């Protein structure tokens, strides 16, 4: 049966991580785990996200492509971040080692680029070019790749060890500085180098910084990032009850600044959508919610930011033409955006691990638990959330410490 009462000691610290398939009664949990790994991994041109890169009929690495119909196939830091956290948590060494290269070699920003804001940063959108080779079309970064990267490099280390071809821990390191020095501000995230009191909700992962504490070895850097987590804590709080009740009806948005508010309407050229949408990026908060609860332990704040953002979702169900929640709200109003698809349904599965209401946990669980692995052209986001998910629900996301 559901746990209603998600431990305020989290599994970090425990060692007791949560199975919430098992908890939901589901069977060959670790079958569909492994099935999901090799379907997004297999060259399939199914369900894969995972692609070699050659040169003049040399291999070379890894990406996982970012498939978009509308704009055009491209290779996001997002996506190559995550893969190598997959990876990772099923000791899938190859598949990380490929992807970790192809990161290095192409998406990295040189660290004597003439714009200091973006040295040693990762490009956010690679695509190839119409003669199949690979360039840098935004060398802008997109940080919660960087975060993604620091995360999966420092887990790498600690499971596998640093005498192979990568040194995980120090490529670890130098991320974490990289993230410290070009993509924080007053120890928050930032969306942008380029922009000042600004931050992106889906972005904020506490249990990662507290991760980021325990691995580096010197004081100041120690305490460092156990404040980046409080901060980010604090942060995610402060969104979560400006959200509440009217007027953002409890789900959370796209843009904030760094006392939590919402970011009303358009405030830069080339932003994609209005920084008060409950949209794309914003799916991913409970998610992040539902981790840091499992991982470092679920408090009110956990329950309540989930427990409200769920409760709004039904409800939006019932009051739609076609009994879905939508993928885009803003000040609770349904934005035609289309019926949720697998990667917000996994988002809101993973949700339930802050989760204390039974009623919700079997509706959210059982319509994630139900659909098919992504294919098709939008796979990219749903597929690779998807894969995200499947680990978080099977006990298979966990922190692995590096020893001095
Ligand atoms: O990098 C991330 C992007 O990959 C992400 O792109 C959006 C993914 O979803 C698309 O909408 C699909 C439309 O068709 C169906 O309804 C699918 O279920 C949807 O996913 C959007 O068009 C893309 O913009 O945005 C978030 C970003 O972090």
């Known amino acids: 049966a559901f746990n209603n009462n998600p431990s305020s000691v989290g599994a970090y610290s425990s060692g007791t991580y949560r199975n919430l398939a098992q908890e939901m009664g589901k069977t060959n949990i670790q079958q569909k785990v492994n099935s999901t790994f090799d379907n997004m991994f297999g060259y399939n041109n199914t369900q894969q996200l995972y692609y070699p890169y050659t040169e003049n009929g040399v291999y070379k690495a890894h990406y996982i492509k970012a498939i978009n119909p509308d704009e055009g196939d491209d290779i996001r830091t997002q996506g190559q971040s995550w893969g190598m956290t997959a990876a990772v948590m099923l000791n899938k060494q190859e598949e990380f080692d490929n992807l970790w ?20 940063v990762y490009a956010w959108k690679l695509k190839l070019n119409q003669n199949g080779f690979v360039y840098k079309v935004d060398e802008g970064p997109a940080p ?21 071809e990568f040194n995980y821990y120090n490529d670890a390191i130098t991320m974490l500085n990289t993230i410290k020095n070009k ?14 009191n600004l931050t992106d909700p889906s972005y904020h992962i506490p249990a990662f910084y507290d991760y980021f504490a325990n691995n580096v070895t ?22 979560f009850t400006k959200v509440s009740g009217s007027p953002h009806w409890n789900l959370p948005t796209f843009l904030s600044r760094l006392d939590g508010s ?48 769920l409760g709004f979702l039904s409800y939006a169900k019932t009051n739609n033409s076609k009994n879905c929640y939508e993928q885009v709200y803003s000040y609770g109003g349904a934005q035609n955006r289309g019926c949720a698809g697998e990667g917000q349904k996994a988002a809101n599965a993973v949700a339930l691990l802050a989760s204390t209401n039974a009623g919700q946990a079997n509706e ?4 994630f638990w139900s659909l098919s692995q992504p294919t098709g052209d939008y796979r990219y986001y749903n597929g690779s959330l998807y ?5 978080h629900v099977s006990g298979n996301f966990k922190f692995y410490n590096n020893t001095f």
């Open 262 to 309: 919402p970011v009303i309407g358009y405030i830069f050229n080339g932003q994609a959508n209005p920084g008060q949408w409950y949209e794309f990026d914003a799916w991913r908060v409970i998610m992040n919610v539902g981790l840091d609860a499992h991982l470092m332990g679920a408090q009110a704040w956990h329950k309540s930011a989930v427990n409200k953002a």
């Open 218 to 239: 010197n004081q100041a850097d120690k305490n460092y990032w156990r404040q980046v987590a409080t901060k980010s804590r604090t942060l995610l709080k402060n969104h």
């Open 144 to 164: 919660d790749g960087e975060e993604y990267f620091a995360f999966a490099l420092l887990n790498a280390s600690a499971r596998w060890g640093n005498s192979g």
């Open 101 to 120: 290269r192809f990161a290095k070699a192409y998406q990295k920003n040189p660290d004597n680029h003439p714009d200091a804001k973006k040295q040693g």
């Open 183 to 196: 993509l924080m501000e007053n120890q928050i995230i930032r969306f942008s180098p380029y922009i000042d």
């Open 387 to 391: 894969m995200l998910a499947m680990l």
């Open 364 to 367: 959210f669980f059982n319509e």
